[PDB]
């Protein structure tokens, strides 16, 4: 028993991280087979930050302008191209540690593990969710760009995030590994703001099921509610609408605990309306929304990865 | 900016995990050089759980009773010995992935990363602290015994925990890697209980400094307090005494933020006495105590590991 924000083991991703240096800018890159992926703003200069034309910027560059370092071994760049907001550096050496991998663009509400890196060296790993406003509440300092977020499915690493920038509110913006930003953000030094965030309702319900699996039942009740009437309460408290498709995803957890989905909704309703009254759930005094139904089942059941 | 429960990258430890099977018991082992470490209760049988004599149990065993599996490759046991509550299985193959490593016995209040494993396969990684009562609030199911907890210092993995058992309150008990239990626990199936826990005061203060580093100051005040008068408040709220040595460890954080240690103590005093009044600190509505001063400096500054 017990319940923790669990990240995936990071070994398979640690073996892919490299240092990419260009001009006075150093950040991280992801070395898969003979390609190194990294944010295109590596080619920006301190006076280019404001409104760069990366097409102009890149056609002025040579391969030897890109210092790529894999540990104590420098990799030679033999080609470069830009795809959306990511740079792809063709190198002469294939990474022998390249895992089986996929690139995936995730939906808001999905969670992933971030391997925070600096200078091609992993610093730490933690768990994030893609917020409904397409930011992530990460932990990122200067030098961390090009750190990736990922999920592991048996032996396959699904890369879903690459870090690019920090917004004034202290949340983080980035792209998928094909360089498309999550959300309306752009890699320009211009006034941009998160957008109003909302709480991920389906995830909070997953976490309440995790609490029941783990022996907290103080928040249950005998009441129930309709999906319509639940969503009328949610919108008041700035939660996302719960869809029937969400209900269905919560099927297994409902079946394993014997608590109908809409019965858990009535519990959440009263928690929203009355607060927790000095009590905690899974060691939290807030309603937690960065575990998906899948995360709960993985951790409360014991799924591993080779 | 941002602040997350960060675990260490787990790659170096993932390469050391193996499956150890004996009789009807399967758990994890740690393969370093030509030795596999694992809990001695692997030799227990379902009727031995109650009060085993492991010396008797072990002298009845043969090397070929120990199934050790490293992925799809079985390792041959060529010797075995017991050290305190851990078994050391001598194998004929040295692990080529053996990192530079140390075994260390940590003090309560120190944090570490746990690589939760099942069947020799890592499932996930999360961050724990050794509670003042020498339990850990882990996340562990059947099969997880022999999962290790660890810290990384540049390139060196310091192993500090190996998982053995779960207590009725749902917290977890285990040993250092030389087999000495943390706390008064024993590997017998007998009535044992955690002991009253307390909050790790020096860590809460470290976390409040992390919040200031990250832009929350709502909880500060102009007051101050003496160490004596602070500790008189702490004991009332079931916090551990703050020592002058704790004050000294908080020196750098005090210096980087400009907030004298005892000034932060006066903030904690009023948070203890008035609660947070619907506000949060670093996304928590509770006072967080599982970041050490060192953890805060590592994450707010950017230290990595090769
Ligand atoms: C990559 O190592 C670095 C990682 C950042 C630094 C701090 N934490 C992080 O996550 N990324 C950047 O520094 C990034 C650089 C590129 C270069 C030009 C093209 C896009 C950005 N810059 C930022 O993250 C800045 N954020 C930002 O520009 O947000 C939009 C914006 C632009 C202009 C004005 C405003 Cl008010 C807002 C960060 C460094 O700036 C602040 C944190 C101060 C907002
Ligand atoms: C190893 O894979 C496993 C990991 C446990 C299972 C569930 N979560 C975990 O962390 N460890 C055990 O199952 C361990 C087995 C050894 C075998 C004999 C020698 C010591 C224990 N058993 C336990 O963890 C049990 N806990 C326990 O025995 O606590 C002290 C105790 C003993 C007797 C009676 C009581 Cl009331 C308390 C667990 C499995 O038992 C409960 C979780 C039900 C307390």
XYZ file of C-alpha atoms and ligand atoms in Angstrom:
700
model
C 0.000 0.000 0.000
C 0.945 3.691 -0.103
C 0.649 6.215 -2.910
C 3.356 8.489 -4.242
C 3.916 10.657 -7.296
C 5.802 8.022 -9.188
C 7.923 8.840 -12.219
C 9.020 6.214 -14.725
C 12.537 4.801 -14.425
C 14.699 7.246 -16.386
C 17.581 4.983 -17.442
C 16.389 4.583 -21.035
C 16.185 8.381 -21.465
C 19.405 9.235 -19.554
C 21.380 7.365 -22.246
C 20.020 9.711 -24.913
C 20.883 13.078 -23.420
C 23.627 15.217 -24.901
C 24.888 18.780 -24.703
C 24.227 21.058 -27.687
C 26.173 24.319 -27.875
C 25.784 27.054 -30.472
C 27.355 30.476 -30.119
C 26.823 31.489 -26.489
C 23.825 29.177 -25.932
C 24.095 25.752 -24.312
C 21.125 23.449 -23.814
C 20.229 19.767 -23.991
C 19.535 17.529 -26.948
C 17.993 14.123 -27.402
C 20.192 11.674 -29.306
C 18.157 8.908 -30.970
C 19.855 6.822 -33.659
C 21.987 9.298 -35.663
C 19.842 12.421 -34.964
C 20.037 14.944 -32.111
C 16.776 16.825 -31.377
C 16.766 20.171 -29.559
C 14.900 23.496 -29.411
C 15.463 25.688 -32.428
C 16.042 28.721 -30.252
C 19.565 27.356 -29.693
C 20.454 29.359 -32.833
C 19.094 32.622 -31.339
C 21.449 35.304 -30.034
C 20.760 37.579 -27.070
C 19.643 40.347 -29.478
C 17.665 37.892 -31.670
C 15.369 36.879 -28.758
C 12.796 39.566 -29.580
C 11.344 38.451 -32.948
C 13.630 35.957 -34.726
C 13.218 34.642 -38.253
C 14.607 31.147 -37.731
C 14.596 30.393 -41.445
C 16.988 33.316 -42.001
C 18.878 32.372 -38.851
C 19.376 28.743 -39.884
C 20.444 29.329 -43.493
C 23.320 31.419 -42.079
C 24.559 28.505 -39.970
C 27.135 25.823 -40.758
C 27.271 22.269 -39.398
C 30.475 23.091 -37.510
C 28.624 25.833 -35.645
C 26.905 23.053 -33.656
C 28.944 21.702 -30.744
C 27.275 18.382 -29.775
C 28.779 16.609 -26.778
C 27.846 13.130 -25.528
C 29.649 12.868 -22.210
C 33.367 13.237 -22.894
C 32.922 12.476 -26.616
C 32.119 15.149 -29.175
C 29.740 14.168 -31.992
C 30.239 15.566 -35.482
C 27.210 17.218 -37.091
C 26.824 16.303 -40.774
C 23.469 17.915 -41.504
C 20.769 19.964 -39.904
C 17.148 20.710 -40.544
C 14.311 22.472 -38.783
C 10.932 20.834 -38.166
C 8.410 23.291 -36.673
C 10.145 24.542 -33.481
C 12.736 21.763 -33.111
C 16.117 21.438 -34.724
C 17.248 18.028 -35.972
C 21.036 17.654 -36.076
C 22.242 14.767 -38.225
C 25.378 13.280 -36.632
C 27.852 10.723 -37.945
C 27.400 8.318 -34.972
C 24.252 6.390 -34.096
C 23.512 6.341 -30.374
C 24.089 2.698 -29.288
C 21.853 3.304 -26.272
C 18.878 4.241 -28.466
C 15.830 2.557 -26.871
C 12.729 1.439 -28.663
C 10.787 4.690 -28.845
C 7.813 6.593 -30.279
C 7.015 10.312 -30.517
C 3.511 11.100 -29.242
C 1.546 14.300 -28.846
C -0.446 14.016 -25.636
C -3.888 15.477 -24.697
C -4.242 17.895 -21.759
C -4.771 15.915 -18.564
C -2.198 13.253 -19.432
C 0.824 12.847 -17.205
C 4.458 12.215 -17.983
C 7.864 12.029 -16.367
C 10.418 14.818 -16.912
C 14.143 14.089 -16.809
C 15.442 17.518 -15.856
C 18.870 18.020 -17.417
C 21.661 20.610 -17.543
C 24.675 20.424 -19.896
C 23.582 17.012 -21.141
C 23.688 15.594 -17.595
C 20.457 14.456 -15.901
C 19.776 16.296 -12.663
C 16.518 14.656 -11.541
C 13.213 13.090 -12.466
C 9.701 14.068 -11.500
C 6.091 13.626 -12.610
C 4.054 16.353 -14.444
C 0.660 16.683 -16.108
C -0.162 18.690 -19.212
C -2.433 21.337 -17.723
C -5.738 22.136 -19.469
C -4.097 25.405 -20.547
C -1.142 23.513 -22.119
C 1.434 24.651 -19.609
C 3.240 22.299 -17.253
C 4.096 23.137 -13.655
C 7.667 21.957 -14.006
C 10.908 22.616 -12.188
C 13.305 24.192 -14.671
C 16.239 26.620 -14.508
C 18.423 28.211 -17.138
C 20.131 25.498 -19.157
C 17.233 23.054 -18.899
C 15.818 23.576 -22.394
C 15.773 20.369 -24.392
C 14.948 18.254 -21.342
C 12.249 15.812 -22.418
C 9.103 14.427 -20.873
C 8.115 10.854 -21.544
C 6.143 7.724 -20.728
C 7.290 4.111 -20.841
C 5.098 1.249 -22.109
C 6.701 -2.104 -21.491
C 10.009 -1.547 -23.304
C 9.021 1.467 -25.439
C 9.729 5.091 -24.490
C 7.024 7.479 -25.749
C 8.518 10.999 -25.861
C 5.788 13.615 -25.491
C 7.473 16.881 -24.344
C 10.600 18.916 -24.953
C 11.265 21.924 -22.731
C 11.526 25.414 -24.322
C 10.608 28.317 -22.035
C 9.261 29.631 -18.746
C 6.240 31.951 -18.558
C 5.956 34.904 -16.129
C 3.681 32.934 -13.791
C 6.491 30.427 -13.298
C 4.883 27.614 -15.354
C 6.568 26.078 -18.368
C 5.902 25.863 -22.075
C 7.237 23.470 -24.668
C 6.668 21.287 -27.695
C 6.175 17.709 -28.707
C 9.279 16.088 -30.207
C 8.210 17.150 -33.683
C 8.429 20.744 -32.528
C 4.782 21.782 -32.269
C 4.108 23.828 -29.186
C 1.583 22.628 -26.732
C -0.865 25.524 -26.464
C -0.854 28.895 -28.222
C 2.753 29.680 -27.332
C 5.518 30.670 -29.730
C 9.309 30.769 -29.290
C 9.540 34.570 -29.384
C 10.503 36.840 -26.525
C 7.119 38.374 -26.494
C 4.396 39.021 -24.003
C 2.623 35.667 -23.572
C 0.499 34.386 -20.703
C -0.786 31.000 -19.622
C -4.515 31.301 -19.942
C -6.924 30.413 -17.158
C -6.338 26.921 -15.840
C -8.910 24.411 -14.607
C -8.714 21.310 -12.427
C -8.590 17.923 -14.189
C -11.807 16.359 -12.930
C -11.306 12.843 -14.268
C -7.901 12.719 -12.553
C -9.203 13.894 -9.158
C -11.758 11.072 -9.356
C -8.980 8.621 -10.206
C -7.059 9.817 -7.122
C -10.102 9.446 -4.869
C -10.312 5.837 -6.106
C -6.613 5.448 -5.253
C -7.408 6.667 -1.739
C -10.170 4.058 -1.373
C -7.836 1.350 -2.673
C -5.439 2.498 0.070
C -7.952 2.549 2.961
C -9.257 6.146 3.153
C -13.043 6.139 2.951
C -13.893 9.108 5.199
C -15.079 11.161 2.191
C -17.566 8.675 0.753
C -21.318 9.029 1.224
C -24.533 7.255 0.340
C -25.632 9.984 -2.092
C -25.339 9.936 -5.841
C -25.673 12.530 -8.585
C -26.320 12.730 -12.288
C -23.555 13.588 -14.737
C -25.449 16.774 -15.622
C -25.887 17.858 -11.997
C -22.288 16.988 -11.215
C -20.978 19.101 -14.086
C -23.129 22.021 -12.896
C -21.173 21.899 -9.612
C -17.809 21.388 -11.330
C -18.082 24.485 -13.525
C -18.816 26.551 -10.397
C -15.543 25.386 -8.821
C -13.538 25.720 -12.061
C -13.280 21.976 -12.751
C -13.353 20.589 -16.251
C -16.561 18.940 -17.459
C -16.678 15.220 -16.862
C -17.683 13.410 -20.036
C -19.283 10.028 -20.455
C -15.985 8.983 -21.991
C -14.297 9.947 -18.710
C -16.898 7.874 -16.846
C -16.006 4.913 -19.053
C -12.243 5.311 -18.481
C -12.962 5.188 -14.736
C -14.707 1.824 -15.251
C -12.019 -0.534 -13.923
C -11.408 1.584 -10.814
C -15.134 1.724 -10.132
C -15.275 -2.060 -10.588
C -12.299 -2.808 -8.344
C -13.618 -0.646 -5.485
C -17.354 -1.258 -5.918
C -18.042 2.487 -5.981
C -20.062 3.591 -9.009
C -18.441 6.464 -10.908
C -21.376 8.765 -10.274
C -21.263 7.852 -6.583
C -17.666 9.074 -6.478
C -18.894 12.215 -8.225
C -21.296 12.879 -5.341
C -18.356 12.511 -2.943
C -16.333 15.040 -4.945
C -19.349 17.373 -4.988
C -19.515 17.448 -1.184
C -15.723 17.805 -0.914
C -15.974 20.774 -3.279
C -18.870 22.284 -1.321
C -17.681 21.591 2.250
C -13.922 21.383 1.925
C -12.017 18.722 3.812
C -12.558 20.205 7.290
C -8.994 19.670 8.521
C -8.694 16.152 7.084
C -6.346 14.754 4.437
C -6.527 12.315 1.540
C -3.385 10.336 0.694
C -1.367 12.834 2.718
C -2.760 15.825 0.826
C -4.996 18.627 2.067
C -5.788 19.594 -1.551
C -7.654 17.582 -4.173
C -4.905 16.103 -6.331
C -5.295 16.153 -10.101
C -2.000 14.941 -11.585
C -2.691 11.191 -11.475
C -4.602 9.720 -14.408
C -6.827 6.652 -14.099
C -4.022 4.747 -15.800
C -1.466 6.033 -13.257
C -3.627 4.831 -10.380
C -4.029 1.357 -11.873
C -0.313 1.097 -12.660
C 0.755 1.947 -9.099
C -1.945 0.166 -7.137
C -1.405 -3.009 -9.259
C 2.369 -3.212 -9.862
C 3.113 -2.916 -13.609
C 6.845 -2.865 -14.529
C 8.929 -2.281 -17.702
C 11.675 -4.099 -19.511
C 11.613 28.263 -11.212
C 9.142 25.693 -9.864
C 9.565 23.075 -7.160
C 8.784 19.387 -7.399
C 9.548 16.246 -5.425
C 12.528 15.307 -7.504
C 14.028 11.829 -7.428
C 17.530 11.077 -8.674
C 17.921 9.619 -12.163
C 17.542 5.864 -11.657
C 19.563 4.526 -14.601
C 22.599 3.571 -12.512
C 20.407 1.534 -10.127
C 18.124 -0.009 -12.803
C 21.178 -1.833 -14.214
C 21.714 -3.575 -10.876
C 18.287 -5.057 -10.275
C 17.702 -8.783 -10.557
C 15.065 -11.334 -9.632
C 15.816 -13.679 -6.722
C 13.603 -16.743 -6.315
C 13.739 -19.292 -3.511
C 11.050 -21.894 -2.954
C 7.739 -20.084 -3.448
C 9.147 -16.604 -2.706
C 10.204 -14.153 -5.410
C 11.647 -10.729 -4.661
C 14.314 -8.348 -5.929
C 18.058 -8.349 -5.461
C 20.806 -5.830 -5.991
C 23.642 -7.079 -8.195
C 26.905 -5.216 -7.534
C 30.126 -6.743 -8.858
C 29.761 -10.517 -8.296
C 27.364 -10.302 -5.288
C 23.553 -10.170 -5.192
C 22.061 -8.559 -2.047
C 18.487 -9.273 -0.941
C 16.337 -9.648 2.188
C 17.056 -12.782 4.159
C 13.371 -13.534 4.517
C 13.539 -14.881 0.946
C 14.446 -18.201 2.621
C 11.293 -18.150 4.809
C 8.321 -20.379 4.007
C 4.677 -19.471 4.579
C 4.719 -21.449 7.865
C 8.161 -20.069 8.863
C 6.894 -16.439 8.856
C 5.952 -16.544 12.547
C 9.322 -16.838 14.350
C 12.087 -18.054 12.008
C 15.611 -19.025 12.995
C 17.423 -17.882 9.861
C 20.675 -19.508 10.931
C 18.917 -22.897 10.969
C 17.038 -21.962 7.810
C 20.174 -21.002 5.878
C 22.355 -23.974 6.837
C 19.648 -26.189 5.284
C 19.914 -24.379 1.947
C 22.044 -25.154 -1.104
C 23.392 -22.690 -3.676
C 21.150 -24.218 -6.347
C 18.114 -23.372 -4.226
C 18.655 -19.726 -5.253
C 17.211 -18.812 -8.651
C 18.860 -15.478 -9.604
C 17.684 -13.946 -12.868
C 19.163 -10.868 -14.564
C 16.715 -10.132 -17.355
C 16.629 -13.169 -19.635
C 19.932 -14.507 -18.245
C 20.119 -16.728 -15.184
C 23.079 -16.173 -12.841
C 24.684 -19.116 -11.066
C 25.056 -18.817 -7.290
C 28.426 -20.094 -6.042
C 28.205 -19.080 -2.394
C 25.907 -17.457 0.083
C 26.222 -15.774 3.421
C 24.008 -13.827 5.781
C 24.958 -10.404 7.146
C 22.451 -9.167 9.757
C 19.094 -9.226 7.888
C 20.430 -9.332 4.314
C 21.526 -12.296 2.275
C 24.615 -11.986 0.079
C 24.589 -14.375 -2.886
C 27.990 -14.872 -4.496
C 27.510 -15.336 -8.256
C 29.954 -16.392 -10.956
C 29.399 -13.247 -13.107
C 30.328 -9.690 -12.173
C 27.676 -7.148 -13.127
C 29.245 -5.081 -15.965
C 26.818 -2.262 -15.176
C 28.094 -1.951 -11.596
C 28.319 1.806 -10.888
C 30.679 3.469 -8.491
C 28.828 3.003 -5.214
C 28.898 3.233 -1.411
C 26.671 1.736 1.295
C 25.529 4.361 3.811
C 23.287 4.252 6.848
C 21.287 7.468 6.895
C 19.939 9.526 9.864
C 16.188 10.124 10.276
C 15.192 13.223 8.325
C 17.367 12.397 5.318
C 15.709 11.802 1.979
C 16.367 9.281 -0.745
C 14.979 7.985 -4.007
C 13.286 4.563 -4.165
C 13.349 2.510 -7.358
C 10.238 0.411 -6.834
C 10.740 -2.977 -8.478
C 8.848 -6.227 -9.086
C 10.433 -9.419 -10.485
C 13.729 -7.626 -11.038
C 12.039 -5.044 -13.291
C 11.844 -1.390 -12.191
C 8.287 -0.116 -11.970
C 8.852 3.502 -10.895
C 10.887 6.000 -8.934
C 9.848 8.365 -6.187
C 11.299 10.393 -3.316
C 11.030 9.361 0.401
C 12.357 10.548 3.751
C 13.393 8.384 6.680
C 10.739 9.354 9.209
C 11.807 10.199 12.781
C 10.274 6.851 13.770
C 12.423 4.994 11.178
C 9.567 4.061 8.896
C 9.223 5.339 5.348
C 5.923 6.297 3.745
C 6.636 4.330 0.600
C 4.550 2.823 -2.161
C 5.115 -0.929 -2.094
C 3.103 -4.035 -3.010
C 3.786 -7.731 -2.719
C 6.928 -8.581 -4.657
C 8.636 -5.262 -3.944
C 11.006 -6.486 -1.228
C 14.625 -5.905 -2.146
C 13.854 -2.617 -3.894
C 16.528 -0.157 -2.797
C 16.600 3.485 -1.834
C 19.569 5.604 -2.780
C 21.234 8.960 -3.346
C 23.617 9.979 -6.113
C 26.666 12.212 -5.544
C 28.294 13.192 -8.798
C 28.956 9.718 -10.224
C 28.620 7.677 -7.010
C 25.438 5.871 -5.940
C 25.030 5.769 -2.141
C 22.629 2.915 -1.289
C 20.867 3.599 2.007
C 17.685 1.432 2.080
C 16.489 -2.021 1.114
C 12.779 -2.793 1.377
C 11.607 -5.614 3.711
C 8.066 -5.241 5.062
C 4.883 -3.227 5.470
C 3.479 -2.298 8.892
C -0.259 -2.295 9.744
C -0.465 1.497 9.431
C 0.579 1.173 5.792
C 4.124 2.563 6.269
C 7.221 0.586 5.381
C 10.169 -0.875 7.226
C 13.557 -1.951 5.965
C 17.304 -2.103 6.399
C 20.483 -0.498 5.220
C 22.384 -2.553 2.637
C 24.348 -4.272 5.382
C 21.079 -5.626 6.716
C 20.534 -3.586 9.876
C 16.953 -2.505 10.266
C 16.172 1.123 10.509
C 14.272 1.421 13.788
C 13.326 -1.263 16.309
C 11.809 -3.584 13.714
C 12.667 -7.235 13.156
C 11.922 -9.571 10.230
C 9.438 -11.718 12.163
C 5.721 -11.964 11.551
C 4.991 -10.476 14.877
C 2.970 -7.639 16.256
C 5.051 -4.510 15.574
C 3.979 -0.882 15.313
C 5.555 2.291 13.995
C 5.938 4.447 17.045
C 4.693 8.019 17.241
C 5.990 10.128 14.388
C 6.989 13.794 14.438
C 7.424 16.431 11.744
C 10.972 17.120 10.509
C 11.382 20.746 11.540
C 14.667 21.481 9.789
C 13.164 20.208 6.522
C 9.990 22.321 6.779
C 12.254 25.356 7.214
C 14.258 24.295 4.164
C 11.000 24.081 2.169
C 9.863 27.523 3.327
C 13.203 28.833 2.011
C 12.486 27.031 -1.275
C 9.148 28.848 -1.417
C 10.872 32.219 -0.937
C 13.421 31.341 -3.620
C 10.403 30.649 -5.856
C 8.464 33.868 -5.116
C 6.047 33.005 -2.271
C 6.554 35.421 0.607
C 2.991 35.693 1.959
C 3.960 33.800 5.145
C 6.912 35.945 6.204
C 6.677 38.519 8.985
C 8.812 41.086 10.751
C 8.896 39.102 14.011
C 11.674 36.894 15.254
C 12.008 34.300 17.998
C 14.675 32.617 20.052
C 15.659 29.006 19.444
C 14.367 28.160 22.927
C 11.003 29.868 22.404
C 10.669 28.340 18.959
C 11.264 24.828 20.275
C 8.638 25.416 22.982
C 6.108 25.960 20.168
C 7.406 23.047 18.082
C 6.993 20.454 20.837
C 3.370 21.588 21.263
C 2.676 20.859 17.584
C 4.664 17.592 17.566
C 7.644 18.956 15.612
C 11.165 17.811 16.299
C 13.456 20.134 18.256
C 15.503 22.436 16.084
C 19.152 22.304 17.101
C 21.863 24.870 16.613
C 23.389 22.371 14.214
C 20.162 22.538 12.188
C 20.406 26.343 12.247
C 23.928 26.060 10.852
C 22.890 23.662 8.058
C 20.268 26.239 7.039
C 23.052 28.839 6.705
C 23.390 28.974 2.908
C 19.621 29.175 2.376
C 19.370 31.957 4.938
C 22.242 33.736 3.167
C 20.802 33.355 -0.330
C 17.370 34.683 0.688
C 18.446 37.249 3.291
C 16.062 35.761 5.860
C 17.754 34.897 9.155
C 17.095 31.318 10.269
C 15.366 32.442 13.441
C 13.233 34.840 11.398
C 12.006 31.877 9.360
C 11.321 30.142 12.668
C 8.968 32.970 13.664
C 7.165 32.503 10.337
C 6.773 28.775 11.009
C 5.532 29.570 14.525
C 2.682 31.709 13.181
C 1.892 29.149 10.463
C 1.687 26.514 13.200
C -0.498 28.736 15.387
C -2.789 30.239 12.716
C -2.761 27.664 9.950
C -2.561 28.780 6.346
C -6.073 30.273 6.174
C -6.959 28.842 2.759
C -3.580 29.657 1.194
C -0.908 27.368 -0.254
C 2.877 27.159 -0.298
C 4.529 25.616 -3.364
C 1.180 24.097 -4.301
C 0.716 22.469 -0.895
C -1.861 23.203 1.791
C 0.247 21.269 4.336
C 3.700 22.115 5.662
C 6.027 19.866 3.680
C 8.820 18.051 5.490
C 10.419 15.669 2.980
C 12.899 18.103 1.410
C 16.227 18.534 3.186
C 18.250 21.751 3.042
C 20.517 19.930 0.605
C 17.540 18.953 -1.594
C 16.413 22.570 -1.789
C 19.869 23.800 -2.788
C 20.279 21.030 -5.367
C 16.979 21.820 -7.107
C 16.964 25.594 -6.853
C 20.599 25.703 -8.138
C 20.829 22.965 -10.802
C 23.336 20.281 -9.708
C 23.635 17.269 -12.077
C 25.400 13.857 -12.044
C 27.695 11.973 -14.348
C 16.281 27.203 -21.816
O 17.467 26.747 -21.124
C 15.526 28.264 -21.007
C 14.766 27.600 -19.856
C 14.038 28.622 -18.997
C 14.997 29.545 -18.264
C 14.400 29.695 -16.868
N 13.510 28.569 -16.722
C 13.235 27.996 -17.885
O 12.444 27.102 -18.063
N 14.587 28.924 -21.900
C 14.603 30.245 -22.000
O 15.283 30.930 -21.251
C 13.770 30.929 -23.053
C 14.647 31.270 -24.249
C 13.950 31.297 -25.623
C 14.791 32.202 -26.513
C 13.995 33.078 -27.483
C 12.770 32.349 -28.021
C 11.853 31.860 -26.910
C 12.537 31.806 -25.546
N 13.287 32.160 -22.457
C 12.361 32.085 -21.498
O 11.970 31.010 -21.072
C 11.820 33.363 -20.950
N 10.387 33.358 -21.088
C 9.725 34.011 -22.040
O 10.274 34.593 -22.953
O 8.274 33.995 -21.961
C 7.410 34.745 -22.820
C 7.711 36.194 -22.561
C 8.536 36.835 -23.468
C 8.889 38.164 -23.306
C 8.420 38.885 -22.234
C 7.599 38.250 -21.321
Cl 7.047 39.264 -19.955
C 7.228 36.899 -21.460
C 12.128 33.458 -19.458
C 13.604 33.175 -19.165
O 11.794 34.776 -19.008
C 11.070 34.908 -17.774
C 11.147 33.679 -16.884
C 11.668 36.069 -17.012
C 9.596 35.155 -18.068
C 8.118 -8.333 0.172
O 7.800 -8.514 -1.228
C 6.883 -7.931 0.987
C 6.545 -6.461 0.732
C 5.296 -6.031 1.486
C 4.049 -6.742 0.987
C 2.972 -5.662 0.958
N 3.697 -4.415 0.946
C 4.965 -4.571 1.299
O 5.766 -3.685 1.469
N 7.192 -8.129 2.395
C 6.385 -8.868 3.140
O 5.310 -9.264 2.712
C 6.785 -9.235 4.545
C 7.362 -10.643 4.556
C 8.425 -10.940 5.631
C 8.403 -12.446 5.853
C 8.611 -12.889 7.302
C 9.608 -11.994 8.026
C 9.197 -10.529 7.998
C 8.160 -10.216 6.923
N 5.569 -9.217 5.335
C 4.996 -8.041 5.600
O 5.433 -7.000 5.136
C 3.789 -8.036 6.478
N 4.028 -7.154 7.590
C 4.359 -7.564 8.812
O 4.596 -8.722 9.084
O 4.446 -6.546 9.846
C 4.663 -6.820 11.234
C 3.478 -7.619 11.696
C 3.645 -8.990 11.792
C 2.607 -9.815 12.190
C 1.377 -9.289 12.504
C 1.201 -7.921 12.405
Cl -0.433 -7.328 12.823
C 2.238 -7.059 12.000
C 2.593 -7.478 5.710
C 2.427 -8.158 4.348
O 1.413 -7.684 6.495
C 0.480 -6.598 6.614
C 0.633 -5.539 5.536
C -0.913 -7.176 6.500
C 0.670 -5.903 7.955
